[PDB]
Amino acid sequence: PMFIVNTNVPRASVPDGFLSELTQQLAQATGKPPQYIAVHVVPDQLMAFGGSSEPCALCSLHSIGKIGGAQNRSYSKLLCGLLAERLRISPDRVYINYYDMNAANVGWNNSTFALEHH
Amino acid sequence: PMFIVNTNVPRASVPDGFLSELTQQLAQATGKPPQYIAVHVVPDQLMAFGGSSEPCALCSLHSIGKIGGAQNRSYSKLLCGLLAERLRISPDRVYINYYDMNAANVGWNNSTFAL
Amino acid sequence: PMFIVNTNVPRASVPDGFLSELTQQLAQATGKPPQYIAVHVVPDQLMAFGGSSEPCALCSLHSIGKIGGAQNRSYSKLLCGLLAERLRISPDRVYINYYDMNAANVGWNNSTFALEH
Ligand SMILES: *[C@@H](c1ccccc1F)c1ccc2cccnc2c1O
Ligand SMILES: *[C@@H](c1ccccc1F)c1ccc2cccnc2c1O
Ligand SMILES: *[C@H](c1ccccc1F)c1ccc2cccnc2c1O
Incomplete structure (x- = not known):
């Protein structure tokens, strides 16, 4: 799982632990171990x-x-x-695009997550 | 609708009004109200x-x-x-990826547009 | 074909020649002429x-x-x-999303690559 945020909020307004918090919360929410989360x-x-x-x-x-x-x-x-x-971004000024990726279309570690067939 | 432009043109070369013109033209072209457009x-x-x-x-x-x-x-x-x-970017040096999004796959205001 | 890399590696660490090597290696791997590659x-x-x-x-x-x-x-x-x-990025700290785009959904030069209908 991979979560990207683009915002016009200034860098200084991003809390220092924000990336870790997103990582932990996304792990919990997706049921995936944190090691997978970007x-x-x-x-x-x-x-x-x-x-x-x-x-x-x-x-x-x-x-x-x-x-x-x-x-x-x-x-x-x-x-x-x-x-x-x-x-401090109002929820009605947020868009989130959700993408369901096929394992064959996600690359990692010199390969993909399609390991079953050649 | 949502439009993103990534370019190597310097920020100073981006004219006042550019975001607003994009917003207005996209509203016109897609038919969606300007309030929707990012x-x-x-x-x-x-x-x-x-x-x-x-x-x-x-x-x-x-x-x-x-x-x-x-x-x-x-x-x-x-x-x-x-x-x-x-x-001042030549049209033959522009790529645009188009995505048709399912409303259930666009999140907004604590929910999605399927709801 | 277009390839985007987002990384926390600092700009100073991006070597001279990097974009050109990506360009040429991707042309080779996709069998597509370099003119097309972004x-x-x-x-x-x-x-x-x-x-x-x-x-x-x-x-x-x-x-x-x-x-x-x-x-x-x-x-x-x-x-x-x-x-x-x-x-100097470890391969197990890299994700790559692959997208097979339809020609009708790729714009270029005032039009798209669907010219047939
Ligand atoms: C999530 C993920 C991360 C980056 C790009 C695309 C994605 F879908 C993800 C990573 C790894 C993984 C392995 C096995 C099963 N599912 C996975 C994911 O959903
Ligand atoms: C590759 C490409 C570039 C940008 C966005 C999406 C893409 F798929 C590409 C560019 C041009 C082209 C012309 C004819 C046939 N195939 C092409 C591509 O795959
Ligand atoms: C615009 C939009 C923003 C982000 C991702 C995808 C999009 F289409 C948009 C917002 C809301 C909306 C509601 C109903 C019908 N269309 C909509 C949009 O196109």
Whole structure:
């Protein structure tokens, strides 16, 4: 699982432990061990949301499975809550794109997660 | 809908009004209200296109529907036109990835748009 | 085809020649002419892999076709090898998302690559 946050919030406003908190929370939420989880936060971005440059975030979550209607709603509540609490971004100025990745289309460690066939 | 531009053009070369013009033109082209539209411009990037570092752009447009053959060709004309005029990037050094998003896969305001 | 690398490795550590080597190696691996290949490298990123801030990279490769089981494993070996050699990033701290794009969903030069209908 991989979570990316792009925001116009300044770098100094990103709490020091934010990456670890996202990692732990995403581990719990996805049921995947933390060792698999990647997080990427990009502050100070030039963005508009609804024509306004008030604090906002455009995000993506990639996962192999564990993606879908009810699950995604749960992720949104969790992640909007963290962005609101830690970065002070209103949940209605956050977008999160969810991607259900096929194991064959995720590369890692010189190979992919499609190990079953040649 | 959501549009991202990554370019090696310097931030200083990004004109006042650019984000707003993108927002307005995207609202027009996609038919979605301006309040929906998110735009994100990332200048000063380390990029090569065809092995050359002349001005170029790599872009994406996500949308719930309104993605398709003729529509995408129309978006490309619109967006390449703007990037050429405003950022002086040649249209043949722009790539735009189009994504048709399912509403259940776009999160917003503590939920998704399937709800 | 376009390849993006986001990494917490500092810009100073990105070696002269890196983008060009990516460009030429990707042309070779995809069998596509270099003229088509776009590369984008983003250093100095605030990111974690497994909760650790040791060097890591999150990457993507988009291609119209030439995406699939064996091909992607080959791309991974190639690109992890280059990231390891050039940026000193361990292959097990690299993720690469592969996207098989439809020609109708890739814009270029005022249009797309779907010209048939
Ligand atoms: C999550 C993940 C991380 C980076 C890019 C794309 C992804 F889907 C993930 C990583 C590894 C993994 C191994 C086995 C089963 N599932 C996995 C993931 O969902
Ligand atoms: C590769 C490519 C570049 C940018 C975004 C998405 C892509 F798939 C690519 C570029 C151009 C092209 C022309 C004809 C046939 N295939 C092509 C590609 O795969
Ligand atoms: C715009 C949008 C933003 C991020 C990802 C994908 C998108 F399409 C958008 C926001 C909300 C919305 C609601 C209903 C129908 N379409 C919508 C959009 O296109």
